[PDB]
Design a protein around this ligand. Sequence first.
Ligand SMILES: Nc1nc2[nH]c(CCNc3ccc(C(=O)N[C@@H](CCC(=O)O)C(=O)O)cc3)cc2c(=O)[nH]1
Length: 207
Amino acid sequence: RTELLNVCMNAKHHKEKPGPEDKLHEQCRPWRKNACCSTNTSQEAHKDVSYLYRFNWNHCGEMAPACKRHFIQDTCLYECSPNLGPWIQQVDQSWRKERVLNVPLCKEDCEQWWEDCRTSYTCKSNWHKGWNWTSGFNKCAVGAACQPFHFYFPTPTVLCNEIWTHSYKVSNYSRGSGRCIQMWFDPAQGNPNEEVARFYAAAMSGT
Ligand SMILES: Nc1nc2[nH]c(CCNc3ccc(C(=O)N[C@@H](CCC(=O)O)C(=O)O)cc3)cc2c(=O)[nH]1
């Protein structure tokens, strides 16, 4: 891994290389200029128990729209961003050779994500391992474990870090500091992650 900019990780769905995709679905739209995902990938992002991972958001009763939308953006960011290089690593599992680890999510993105989920419900604090997939999609391990979302994710930083086994590492930096990744941004104002990736690829450069 010598070049960490304008590159796609090697997971279950990514393309080999970044590239224009003017047909991306609704929330994935800000990556139409340069994406790692396909029209279909972005399309399944937005759906319940998707073709992507058969993942069930409504494992603890219906998940509130205001919350689910954040998960859809995350999915977009993970499946579409070309600027995640500096945090790519190898792990070698049955469904992805590579993945991202300790992405410095902008303080607010995390807080807002945390905030919008207050009303929703979950049963696990780790959404990568532990689900009963018998049914065809992930169901609750201990069916009676269903608690308020903030019960398993007490603070924002807990949510963003632990829910995806440390794919994020919530930065102290705020949106626009040039030092953290935004999973929400206005494409009309340009892709702010492009400068963030470039910065961090230099701070860890050489050996
Ligand atoms: N930011 C960010 N978002 C992300 N979204 C996703 C999507 C990832 N969803 C899935 C989570 C769990 C499963 C699953 O079958 N688990 C098994 C064990 C999984 C395994 O080790 O083989 C279990 O329950 O025991 C499938 C998809 C990743 C991911 C990520 O890495 N980062």
